[PDB]
Each structure stands twice: as C-alpha cells, then as structure tokens.
Scaffold this active site. Structure first.
Site, short mmCIF file in Angstrom:
data_model
loop_
_atom_site.label_atom_id
_atom_site.label_comp_id
_atom_site.label_asym_id
_atom_site.label_seq_id
_atom_site.Cartn_x
_atom_site.Cartn_y
_atom_site.Cartn_z
N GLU A 274 29.53 -2.03 -0.48
CA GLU A 274 29.18 -2.31 -2.07
C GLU A 274 30.81 -2.64 -2.63
O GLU A 274 30.46 -3.90 -3.47
CB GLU A 274 27.90 -2.11 -2.98
N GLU A 277 32.16 -5.35 -0.98
CA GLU A 277 31.31 -6.92 -0.93
C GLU A 277 31.92 -7.67 -2.01
O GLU A 277 32.24 -8.22 -2.20
CB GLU A 277 30.03 -6.61 -0.35
N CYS A 294 19.73 -1.54 -3.98
CA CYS A 294 19.19 0.35 -3.42
C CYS A 294 18.62 0.80 -4.70
O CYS A 294 17.32 1.39 -3.79
CB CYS A 294 20.41 0.95 -4.89
N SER A 314 22.75 -7.93 -3.62
CA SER A 314 23.54 -7.07 -2.68
C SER A 314 23.54 -7.17 -1.02
O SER A 314 22.08 -6.64 -1.25
CB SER A 314 24.28 -5.61 -3.00
N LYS A 353 10.27 3.43 -1.69
CA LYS A 353 11.30 3.61 -0.56
C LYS A 353 9.87 4.18 -0.29
O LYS A 353 10.59 3.90 1.40
CB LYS A 353 11.89 5.11 -0.91
N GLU A 356 10.16 0.72 0.75
CA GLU A 356 10.70 0.18 1.83
C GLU A 356 10.91 0.25 3.29
O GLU A 356 11.39 -0.39 3.93
CB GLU A 356 12.05 0.45 1.12
N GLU A 361 12.32 -5.93 8.50
CA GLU A 361 14.24 -4.93 8.39
C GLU A 361 14.14 -3.73 8.69
O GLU A 361 15.07 -3.85 9.11
CB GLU A 361 13.69 -5.88 7.54
N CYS A 486 16.19 7.19 -11.22
CA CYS A 486 15.36 7.90 -10.28
C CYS A 486 14.96 9.30 -10.94
O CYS A 486 13.77 9.59 -10.03
CB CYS A 486 16.23 8.08 -8.90
S1 SF4 Z 1 12.91 5.62 -8.87
FE1 SF4 Z 1 12.75 3.94 -9.50
S2 SF4 Z 1 14.52 3.87 -9.92
FE2 SF4 Z 1 15.00 4.67 -8.29
S3 SF4 Z 1 14.83 3.83 -6.29
FE3 SF4 Z 1 12.34 4.20 -7.01
S4 SF4 Z 1 11.30 1.92 -8.24
FE4 SF4 Z 1 14.03 2.19 -7.99
#
Ligand code: SF4
Ligand code: SF4
Ligand code: SF4
Ligand code: SF4
Ligand code: SF4
Ligand code: SF4
Ligand code: SF4
Ligand code: SF4
Ligand code: SF4
Ligand code: SF4
Ligand code: SF4
Ligand code: SF4
Ligand code: FES
Ligand code: FES
Ligand code: FES
Lengths: 554, 554, 554
Positions: A274, A277, A294, A314, A353, A356, A361, A486
C-alpha cells in the site's frame, strides 16, 4: 451533600444528575435494567423505584435535594420489582444453555437473585423474528427492547439499519420490513453485538466446522490477528502478557493445527504494498485521496454509501486475505500439497472478516473465520490452563512481523506502518499530528524531496460522513469501523467498552515494544517472499490486489 | 495423630521428625532462629522451647507421641525467649540502616515483634573481623553463628574456605588465619551470601561508581545478562513477564544510559566460537575433555584445584567479557569515539563476574559489574513503577539473540547452544540424555558423519570432584558453580532457594519460547559482526580468546 | 491537563497545589521525606527534585503549567537524592533493632532501597537529648527535625510544650531548657508520638514488668479498654471483627492471666455514678458546668490551665481507676486473697493512662498499664494466630457491659451513657444536637419534668480554649484530648490518622451493635455490686471518687 437513605445519613456528590447515579457513586446499588452498556439510557425498566415523601418514583429521574429521605427497599417496592422482573421473564425466550450471553447476562443474574422459580404470568406468544443470514445473528425472542443497539448503530456507527418497529406488545427492534441483515446496508461491524446485554444479537459460531476440519486428513493452518492476542486474556480473567500469541500457538498445535502463522506478517505485506501504491498515486496525482481497504466494514460501507470513491479505495487486499492468498497460492506449492488439501482458519477480532472471507472476490481462500470469543471457547473447552502453557514461536515462513505490522490491531496502525515504509524508502523530515476531535487525527507529512501530504486516521464509522464533508486537503484516509480500531472489534470478549478497549490498546503497545523488527523491509522473510514469488507486477496484482463494486437494492 | 497444644486438640502427621516441624506443617508457628535457609539445622538458637510434662525443652528435638500435652506459651517460656533474643542483640552490630539484609532479616523482625527497646545486657566487645577485599564482603559483627554459610561452602560448593574458629564468646566464622577472602581459594560464587540470614555476608555495592559515570560526559553502555530478567521481578513482588528485559531497557535509557545491549548476544557469539573450538579438538583428539569457561567461579576453582586441566578449559572468554571486548574494540571504532570514552556497565546475577571483570587478562574492558539486586536498588530509588514502564527493544547491533543464547541463564544452556550450532553446521542424528544424579546430565551425541561424543552438564560445584573422579568417557563438560545455573547466582534476589530458582528457570524458559531465532547462525547481526570485524583467526583470537594460569599460595 | 514526565504524556488534575501532589494523585511517586503524617508540610527534605527547563527544583513547590516537561530521574538528581539521604543517615542514631518505629519507618525503607551500605560522611557528634521521665519517651538522636510533632502539639493539642530550639547543626526539637517532660505542662496525650515518623518519640514499654509478674505466684488480673478491641487488628493486618475482645481474653488466659475483666463495665459504673452527681448538681445549681474527668490528659491540662474549674471537674474517677479500685478493695476480699496478692494489668489505647495509674491519688491500684501496641507485641511474640483463636467471654463479675459503656471508646460515648442513665431514671423528651464546628457537638436536653440543660462533646484539646471562651450556656462538657476520642489515642497502632481513626470508630460501633444490654441499670452485675459493696455514700465516695490539685512550676 446530606441525604437520608433507609433512615441512614449518606453523603453524596453536590452536583449529580439523578439519585440512582449518585447512590451508585457512593456505593449504594439500586436494582435496575437500564444501565447495561455505554450506550444505555434511563427510564425504560422502571425497577429503580424508591419512596420519597411517601410516594414511589424512579430514582433514575429524581434530582437529589438536601435532606431528602428515601426508602430504597419497602414491601411495596419489593413487590413491584419482582412483578416487573416476572413480566420481563414471562415473554423472554428462556434458553440460557444455548445463549451467547449465558454467564454474563444481567437478566439471568437477576432471575437467580430474585428467586424467580415459576412464571406467574403467561408466556403470551409474540411474533418473534429469527435471523441467521449474516455473521451477526438476530433473535428478538431474547430482546428486552433496551434500545442500546439502535443507538449504537445510528449514533456511533452512523448506519442506523436497525430501529424500533410497531408498538405495544408487538414492539420489536428489527430491520426495515424484517429484511435479512445480509441484504441490508449493515456493515457487519458487530458493534451492536458488542453492546447488546442479552443474546438477542450474537455472533455466528463456527466451531463445529473447525472440529470437522481438524478431524479429517487435510492440512489445517491457522493465522492469528494482532488484536486477538491483546484481548483474549479477559475471557480467562487473567492479567495481560506479551507472550499470549505464542501460548496460543502452543495450544493450537496441541489440538492438532499443522501450522500457525502470524497475520501481522500479512499486515507487513499489506503496508509494504500500500505504501508503494500510495506513492505512485501521489506522484501522478491520480485516484486521491486514497482510502485504506483493510477494514472490511468500512469497505462495505463505502460500496453502499460512496460509489464515487470506490476507485479511491486502496486496491490492496486486507491482511487476512493477503496472507491467505499467499498461503493458498504460494506456500501450498512450496509444500508440495494441492491447494485443496489446505484448510485455512483465521482468528480475528472482527465479525466483518467473516463476511469478507465469504466475498465473491475471495471465495475459497479463507475456509473459516473464528472470533476471539470462539478461540476462547476452544481453550475453555479443552480446560487447559492457558496461563501455564509453554510459549513457542509462530511457524516459518510467516511467523515474524515488524512492530509496525502488529500495530494494525489498533486505530492508526496501518497509517503508521505506511509512514514507516515511506520513511525507510523516501525519508520523512517531520510529521505534524493534529486532533480535530475525539476519533480523528490529521498528520502533515513532508518527505525529503518535497511532495508533502496530509493523512487522517478516523476510527468509528459515522465520523466519516462529516469528515469527508469538510476536509478536501487530505491525501490518504484510514478508516476503522470500530472505535479504537480492532481492539474494539465486534468479535472481541464481552463486555467491550471504552475502558476495556483502552486497556487492550495498552496491551498491544506493550507487545509491540518487545519486537526487534522496526519496519516491514527489515522483515527478511517478507523480502524473500517478494523476491521469490511476487517478482513481476502481474503476479503481485493477482495475489495481493482485489476489486470493489457498488451495492444497491431494488 | 492426636496431640494437645495449649489445651487444644491438634491433629498432626503420623510420621514427623520433631514437634516444631509437625506444628509448622499443621499451621502452628514456634518462634525460632534455627530455620533460616535451606542449609539450616536445628538446636542452636534454643528459642523453640515448649513445656511437656511440666518440663521445658526444645521442640525442634522432641519426637511427638500420641496424647502429648504441650504448652507453647508460658510466662517462663516468654521470659526465656526474650532473654535469648536480648542476648543475641546485645552483642549484635545493630546498624540496620546500612545493612544489606535490612527489611528481609528475621532477627530485625523478631526485635520489632518482641518489643525489645533497651539492651538490658552489655554489648561486650568482640574481636570482630571486617573484610572488604572481595566482591563477597564479610562482617562478623552481624553474624549470629548459624553455620548456614559453612555448610553451603563445604557440602554444596565443595570449597570449604570458611569455618568455625575459636570457641565460646570468641567463636567466629572466618577464613584460615583471618586471611582476606580474595587471597583464599574462595571461588566468589556468593552462595554463602545467598544463604546468609543476616548482613554478615553481603555483596559489594557499586552504585556510587555508576552514578559518577552517568553524571560525567562519557558514553555509558549497559548490557543485561539472561538470568537478570528472569528474577528481578521478585524484588518488586510482581508476577513474571517475558517483557522484563525491555522494561529494563526503557528504565536504563530514562536514567541516562546511552546504549543497552543484550548479553545473550554475547552468549550466541561465545557458543558459536566454542562449538568450532570443540569440533576442531574432537577432529584432532587434542585437549579433551573440553571444559566450558563461561562460569568464572568454575574457572577460578579449576585454577586452584585442577592445574592439569587448564589447557582443557575452553579458551573462549565468557559472554560478558566477549561482548565487552567487542563493544570496546569494534563498536567504539564504528561509533567514532575513543575507547576511553566508553563506560561499560554489566548487569549480572553473579558475584564471580565482578571478580572476572577485574581479572588481569580483562583489565579495563568492563568498567563495573552490578548484580540483579543493585539494579533493583536503582529502580526502587527512582520510585518508578517498573511494571507500567513501556518496553522497548535492546539497541542495535547487539540487542538480538537466539533462544539458545538466552538459554545460558540456566544450567545446560551453553551445552544446548553448542549442540545447536553443531547441528546447524554438522547435523545431529539423535541425543540420548541420562541423569546419573540430581545435578548431573550426561548426553550421548552422534553426528551425521559419525564421530559421536558424550557431554555432561554439572551444576553446583562440589559435584565436580566426584564426577571427574569417575567419568573418563565424556568429551565436553559444562560446569556451573551455582545450583540450577545462573538463575541461582549469588547476586540474585534474596531469598534465593530451590523453589525460587526453579520458578526463575520457568520464567527464563517462557522468555526463550517467544524468540523467533532458533540458533546463533540465524542471528544476522552476529553473522555480520563475524563478516566485518572478526574475519581472520588472529583478530578472533585477540578479541574472543583468553588464557588461564595456576593459583597457589606460599 | 497535559504535562510531560520523562518524555511521556501525563494527564493531571486541572487545579493542583504543586507538581508532587499532582503526580502522586496520578500515580507517579517522587521520593521525599516531607510527607510523613497528616501534620506534615513541604520544603524541608529537598529530595523531591525534578528538572524543568534544564534547571533542578523541588516539585513540592512547583505549580504545574500546561506543556511542562519534567525529568523526574536524572543522574544529577540521583546523586543529589543519594547525598541528601546519606547526609540524614550520617548523623542519625542507627539502631533500628531497638527502635519503636522499626519496620514502619520511611527512613529505614529508603536506606534499604537506596542501597546505602556505607556512611561516606562523618557521624559528627550532636548534643543529643535523651528523656525517659514520662510515658512519652524522647530521643533526639533519631529525630529528623520534620516538625510534625511541634505542629501537632501546638495547633492540634493546643499545648505547645515542644518547640524547635537553637539553629544550624544543633537544631533540636525539645522542651524549654531541656526540662524533663514529666515536669512540664505536657498532658501526655501521646499525639506527637502518634504522628512522629521516627523513633524519636516513643511510648515507654512495660512488657518486662508484665513478664515478671506473670512468672511469680501472685494473681494477675487484666482488664481491656473499649477502644483497644476496635484497633488491635491493624497490627496483624486483618479485617475487624466484633469478637476481638473475646479472642484477647482467650489469648491472655493462655499466657497465664488468672482473670480478664472488661473495662467497659467500669465505664458503666462511672456513667451511672456521674449521672447522679450531675443530676444533684443541676438540682442545686452548684459547681456548674460539670466537666467529665474520664480523660486523664484533659484532667492534667485542666490542673495546669484552669485551676478555677477544678471543682467543676467530675469527682468520679475514670473507668480504669474505678474498676481497678473495685478489683482491689472489693473483689480481692470476695476472693479471700490479700490485696497485695493481686497484680492488676490495664490494657489501654492511651499514654495518659500510664500517668494516671501512677498518680498519687491512685498509687498502688493499677500495677501496670500497657497500650494496644504492647498487647500486639505480646501476641506477635507468642506467634499465635490470633484470628484463629477460639473466643471466650470476659470473666465474671466484671465481664459484661451495656453498649453505652462500650461506647466510651469514641468521642461522645460518656455523654451518651450519662444521657442513657438519666433517661432510664428521669426520662428525656427530646435531644437537639448541633455541630458548631468539626470537633464540637452541642446538645439540648429536656427532661420529663422540665429542668432542661445543654451539654457539649469536645474532642481534641485546643478546641477547648476557644469553646470555653465563647459558651456559657452549657451545663456539662465532655472533653477528649485526642481527636475522635480514644480510638485515636496515643497508644494506638501506627499509623494513626483520621481515616484509620474513623474506621476504628466504625468497628467500635459495630461491636456496640451486637450488645443486648442498652443501659447501665440493665447490667445486673453492676446493680449487684452497688447493692452489695457500694451501699452507703461513704463507701461509694471512698471507692469511686478522687480529688484534683493545681499544677504549677516555680
Ligand atoms: S474489528 Fe472493527 S475496525 Fe477492525 S477490521 Fe473489523 S470492523 Fe474494521
Ligand atoms: S439473554 Fe440468554 S442468558 Fe440472559 S436470561 Fe435470556 S436466555 Fe438466559
Ligand atoms: S453490525 Fe454494525 S451496521 Fe450492522 S446492525 Fe450491528 S451496529 Fe449496525
Ligand atoms: S437487541 Fe439487545 S441491545 Fe438491542 S434492544 Fe434488544 S436487548 Fe437491547
Ligand atoms: S542483620 Fe542487619 S537488618 Fe538484621 S538486625 Fe542485624 S543490622 Fe539489622
Ligand atoms: S563465595 Fe562460594 S566459595 Fe567463597 S566463601 Fe562463599 S560459598 Fe564459599
Ligand atoms: S555469616 Fe551468616 S550464614 Fe554464616 S554463620 Fe554468620 S549469620 Fe550464619
Ligand atoms: S553459575 Fe552463573 S551465577 Fe553462578 S558463579 Fe557461575 S556464572 Fe556466576
Ligand atoms: S527511626 Fe528507628 S527504624 Fe527508622 S532508621 Fe532510625 S533507628 Fe532505624
Ligand atoms: S504528649 Fe501531647 S502535650 Fe505532650 S508533647 Fe506530645 S503532643 Fe504535646
Ligand atoms: S520528634 Fe519525630 S515528629 Fe518531631 S521533629 Fe523529630 S522526627 Fe519529626
Ligand atoms: S481521649 Fe482517650 S486516648 Fe486520648 S488521652 Fe483521653 S483517655 Fe487517653
Ligand atoms: S433505571 Fe431503569 S427506569 Fe430507572
Ligand atoms: S529451633 Fe533453634 S534450637 Fe530449636
Ligand atoms: S517533598 Fe520535601 S522538600 Fe519537597
């Protein structure tokens, strides 16, 4: 300030908002179901009743005055409190054994303490809504309609996809038209879950899938996120320790993990890519300002809310997806085993996550995502004394990271890592940091050969809307959906409040302090990976770059 | 087993050596000054008096029998105990403020609790012996003649250079003819100090020299030993933490240290050099068996006791001296400052390192050696909350080490590190470890291309004499003067017993577990040092090799 | 408020008096010897040095400002602090073993922590003053000239019999012309001792006399004061318990006490007699206002300061002397043993009771007075686990008391007991209590048949002078020399501050709450004593009444 409680002289603070809070600060507790999280408000439960001047009233809405005589416990108040608790329980889905909040539920504790052993009232049927379409799972049969989640989602996350609907006995917190959460603009940040005092909002559990994978003959690989190690000691009620991640490695190998890697290595990789980039973008003044990609909650929010900025995102994937793609497309080959043989487990502090990993993708890279709470459940299930486990390092070649990569676990980490990479390649003269408000940090950066820029760190969705409406002088913007980053993720241990999140940030900082690698380029394994398997631009784009698409309903 | 204590029914163990120990194990404490360390014996203090069958006797020499009625506290016993304590104090050098044992002295605590406020008896003059010639400092004016040191030195260390002399009021624990300790065969292991319950035996304090050096304009450099970090938390009564060394780094930089390096880097260097020396010796069958030279107490003992094995000693210097010579003869040049500008402080768990630094072969390399206790005194003096200090890594280029180098802090570490280097160069098929007795481990090693050998780890001097008298089938012998190795060094926090030493070993093992570098050759900084400044054999011999000479009196 | 400490961001309170206190409240401790008690002031020790703007200054006299950068620990500051501590120790009488403050001395702790092992400076002779004429014992060789005692005696006790004298190296805290304390206007309240941070001021120990008496064949009788039981748990670092007095009874019988009686029985007796004396005085309007005579420090103060009010003093003796006279002149006869056979031990929280027992009007009644600290020393000497002792009641016939009698242990108790007796004989309609200031309570009392009166409770000598100068509308005045009453007596455990005294008062209140006898007349044993041995006025006057005489020097 002199007041009388149950015919006893009590000194409270001179300036207080209400009697209940004043007594609490003086050590006198009044039973109540309004104070449940940091997003709570008073007035709904009606259990805080006191007698003043021979009349009963809620102490949460009573301004104390000098000489007030209050009876906090009368037979009448006893009956009223028991009746209100029984009213709540009568229509509550009482299945604590399979409830996510079992053991840390205020309602369960009150039921225990009030000696409620038979439901005098009737469990009159309610049109309950059960939703399991998303990693955030809804079950209104457990909701006590406290409204904490509505406030969190609207005022703190700026999404407001859940609201009070209907009225009276059929009042329900729900999405518009009871639409499945996965089909809404919910960003799956899990903050509502972090604040919910019941099991009405919970995280989808995936332990059964992990057990199935461990029992088969495929190679199970785990990778632990930076913020998991700074918070998982809370589940076991023990003090922090910078050696937590290595104890986790030992535990996971014990229960049959083939390899355990450090996602902070993926953070080093992502920051390294990154930074380049961003430097190219700055050189050609294209696709600015750059937004970090991220945080998947932020990414989904942008796909819903800012389709014009999708190119400004990004293109580098998040540390989880980057490291997972490396494991599946490079390490699998280096190991001599087909990619279909690898089962990749990601341990994260984040509910987004899970979403995600299941994105189109990324399909088939990360097999399962387990949150810090699920990992704690694995440990507790084993009954192993985690604090006495002998630590051992992460496995090569993705078990080492710079302190900058580990810093991803708290807000500002990825920006600091990008600045570290830029400084190590193109030096930085000075950095002037400014704090316009509580969760916004704006830094002025001047490189050696000019071309200065401004970057901002924003933690907590909802601040983003106003910041983007008032700041056109920034070139790079880091967005974390959860306050403090996080360490305050939706999948973190409960309770998950500001003081606990700050303590987790302190733990992560202490863990970063014992690391000898200061920048990603000092990571010899990362350099070797780049030199061996990510040489050409085409391979790098295929392995570490992803796309985004607009999100709309019709 | 039923016994009556002060007219109360007490159940003790069926098989016990004496009444005092049985009551202690059942939770009943009898005041006494015999039980003072792990080298203690009963019968001298005479304060454990009880009344059985109307007659007073010492409970430490009374075998319990069923139905025994014992009065542990009678006016007569009260008077006798107070008289005995007053007898001890009358001729005791009562200067607790400048005493090394102040705050952790049983005699001081008894004086406090017995309400002794005036010396009824007379402080009759004794021909007291004060000795400050060695890092181990003697002051018989504080000795209570418990004899723990005599037993430690004779039976545990196998030296026996201190003994009871004279008799009656002039009884004194002293060397032969009151010779200065530095001129005897004392190996300066400090184990007597570790066991002494008073300030009669103490460690020479060198804090004022450090303050003077820090106040001047010369460059002060510190280096911390492996075993210092596993024990210094005891001084502050807090749980271990693998981040202790980095907190020490932060604290030392705060009080004005220019650089802080890790002596475990020197351990990596020493193991790397010693593995090659040993391999050459094995190839040409010369100067075997090889003795490790890292323990200076063992080295001095050999110079006194085994002049025939002096050539068998490893010629490589100890980690302290090796790293210090590197700092003074290579780093000083790389920094552009004259060697006279550098003040090198070594923080060690060992009193024998103070002697080693002052050896003629090492004169002027290490400026001062401070023990773990002196470092704890620095921290306590600052009043800084060490547990809240933010950690930061050691300084480059000598701030990183493999887990094998850090393992030097406990017995067997240097042998394990040598085996690690040999395996990484000439692989090892298997290792068969055997334990002939408590502090002896014998391992059979087979390399890939044959040429197997046996190596032994011996911790605790005194075991050496018998082992060397009965084992001619070993090629390499590691000797640590202190039981459990350097975690039980003379300069470690008091009390310094077997259980505490085992806990320190556990702490060190956990600290080693979080290290990602497995062997010295994986230390890129060590390899770079060898490649840049230790290329030819002449430079390596000058920098990392030392000599030994016989020690005799006449 | 943002400040930088050792290059670290620290938030302190917006409004603070000085940097040292602000850092302390934020958790940062600066070594210093000024803050030693509640009567301390800043500026004398000079050890709180910090560096601000490259210049060193005392943090106790530095007002913090936003953005201030302070270095709390520099080599220069280190040297200065060590030098100052060494300066103090060089001329300090370093005999901790026989010191009263051994184990709870800040100077001893600093000597331990600063690694002071040799006095670099010279123990230059000072003209030290040693005084053992009084139960309060002075030894200026231990004084650090903090001045806390001077302030306590002048401002808190209103006596001011000790002052700074001379100057420079010969500065000394002493009485006028170094007169023996027993010959001054010192009231022997021991508050200076309660506040002294060293052993310079201590309590005369009398344990050896008790041991001698217990060893002989005379009958030893103990009696425990109300306030002893509410404070002695502090010496053992354990939580309060209302059963403390009975554990003391068991312990004392174990070490050979023949009988143990409750001085609160004597308090019931004294309140019963004093209520009648006061009622007679009110009826005939003679010798008013009445002053209580239970506090011997107040009595001595009045004999020195108010010779006109000596007739206004209550003629009834204090509970100690009253109960002791009963034991010696009635109980001894009822037991069939000569009065010369009885050795009467009084356990008190008060140094002035030692003086009172030795008064000419009381000679030979109370054989020895031991304070709470001396009793704790007896227990600690035995090593018995007092918390595990089985409780047993006090001995008949003086082992029971009403809650009113036990209430004597805290300020206002004797007045409350007098009001209780008056109410039980001549009812009381209402009582209107008023608090003109911190340690003064004024109550309006109306009896059934008119004849209302006002009574005041004053705790803390020094308040008395002004109260008596401004209130002529009170009929009965209770005076306690020590703040909070006897729970804060000079002989109580150290440290002895306001918060600890308040906690002791709470303990005593809880102990009074479990008592079933509400008033002295409900004490059947007291009634039987009056009916059998105190029938006529002559016997009552001889047994329970004493005289007072003026005190002047010439
Ligand atoms: S814990 Fe919260 S800030 Fe960290 S990646 Fe997941 S949603 Fe985003
Ligand atoms: S929320 Fe869950 S744990 Fe709490 S009462 Fe309801 S079912 Fe039980
Ligand atoms: S996960 Fe976040 S966006 Fe979705 S409902 Fe909960 S708080 Fe709102
Ligand atoms: S879902 Fe949870 S936080 Fe939201 S209203 Fe219901 S109980 Fe409260
Ligand atoms: S050994 Fe040291 S601390 Fe103990 S009593 Fe003697 S002088 Fe005091
Ligand atoms: S230092 Fe070791 S060899 Fe020397 S006297 Fe003490 S125990 Fe004996
Ligand atoms: S020097 Fe210490 S250990 Fe040795 S006899 Fe004296 S008091 Fe005991
Ligand atoms: S074993 Fe370690 S602490 Fe003991 S003398 Fe040898 S080097 Fe020093
Ligand atoms: S006051 Fe007493 S305990 Fe404190 S240093 Fe002086 S002699 Fe020692
Ligand atoms: S006992 Fe009381 S009056 Fe006497 S010197 Fe001490 S504080 Fe002053
Ligand atoms: S006698 Fe005690 S309180 Fe008074 S000045 Fe001296 S040290 Fe301070
Ligand atoms: S108030 Fe109590 S402790 Fe203080 S002097 Fe008077 S009687 Fe003694
Ligand atoms: S606290 Fe809930 S209504 Fe008062
Ligand atoms: S314990 Fe020392 S003689 Fe018995
Ligand atoms: S605290 Fe004593 S002079 Fe500052």
């Amino acid at each position: 300030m002199k007041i009388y409680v149950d015919g006893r002289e009590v000194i409270i603070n001179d300036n207080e908002r209400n009697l209940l809070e004043a007594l609490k600060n003086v050590g006198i507790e009044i039973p109540n179901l309004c104070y449940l999280s940091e997003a709570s408000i008073y007035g709904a439960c009606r259990m805080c009743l006191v007698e003043i001047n021979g009349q009963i009233t809620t102490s949460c809405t009573l301004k104390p005055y000098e000489g007030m005589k209050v009876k906090t416990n009368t037979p009448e108040i006893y009956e009223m409190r028991r009746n209100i608790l029984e009213l709540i329980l009568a229509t509550h889905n009482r299945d604590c054994t399979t409830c996510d909040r079992n053991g840390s539920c205020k309602l369960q504790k009150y039921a225990e303490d009030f000696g409620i052993r038979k439901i005098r009232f009737e469990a009159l049927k309610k049109e309950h809504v059960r939703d399991e379409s998303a990693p955030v799972v809804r079950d209104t049969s457990k909701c006590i309609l406290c409204g904490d989640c509505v406030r969190v989602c609207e005022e703190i996350q700026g999404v407001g996809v859940i609201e009070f609907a209907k009225r009276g006995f059929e009042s329900v917190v729900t999405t518009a038209f009871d639409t499945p959460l996965i089909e809404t603009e919910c960003v799956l940040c899990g903050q509502c879950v972090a604040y919910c005092p019941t099991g009405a909002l919970s995280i989808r559990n995936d332990i059964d899938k992990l057990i199935e994978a461990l029992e088969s003959d495929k190679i199970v690989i785990g990778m632990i996120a930076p913020a998991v190690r700074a918070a998982i000691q809370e589940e076991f009620g023990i003090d922090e320790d910078v050696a937590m991640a290595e104890k986790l490695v030992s535990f996971l190998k014990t229960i049959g993990f083939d390899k355990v890697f450090d996602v902070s290595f993926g953070a080093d990789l992502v920051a390294y890519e990154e930074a380049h980039e961003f430097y190219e973008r700055l050189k050609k003044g294209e696709r600015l300002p750059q937004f970090t990609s991220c945080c998947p909650a932020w990414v989904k929010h942008a796909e819903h809310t800012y389709p014009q900025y999708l190119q400004n995102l990004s293109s580098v994937k998040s540390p989880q997806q980057a490291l997972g793609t490396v494991i599946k497309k490079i390490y699998a080959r280096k190991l001599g085993v087909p990619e279909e043989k690898i089962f990749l487990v990601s341990f994260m502090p984040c509910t987004a996550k899970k979403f995600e990993a299941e994105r189109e993708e990324h399909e088939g890279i990360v097999d399962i995502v387990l949150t810090t709470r699920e990992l704690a459940q694995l440990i507790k299930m084993s009954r192993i004394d985690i604090n006495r486990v002998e630590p051992q390092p992460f496995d090569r070649p993705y078990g080492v990271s710079s302190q900058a990569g580990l810093g991803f676990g708290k807000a500002g980490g990825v920006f600091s890592c990008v600045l570290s990479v830029l400084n190590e390649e193109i030096g930085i003269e000075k950095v002037d940091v400014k704090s316009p408000e509580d969760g916004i940090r704006v830094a002025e950066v001047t490189l050696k050969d000019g071309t200065s820029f401004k970057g901002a760190v924003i933690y907590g969705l909802g601040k983003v809307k106003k910041f983007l409406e008032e700041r056109k002088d920034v070139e790079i913007i880091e967005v974390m959906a959860c306050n403090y980053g996080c360490v305050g993720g939706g999948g973190q241990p409960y309770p998950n409040d500001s003081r606990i999140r700050e303590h987790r940030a302190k733990v992560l900082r202490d863990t970063m302090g014992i690391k000898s690698l200061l920048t990603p380029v000092e990571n010899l394994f990362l350099m070797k990976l780049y030199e061996e398997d990510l040489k050409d631009e085409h391979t790098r784009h295929e392995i570490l770059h992803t796309t985004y698409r607009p999100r709309r309903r019709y």
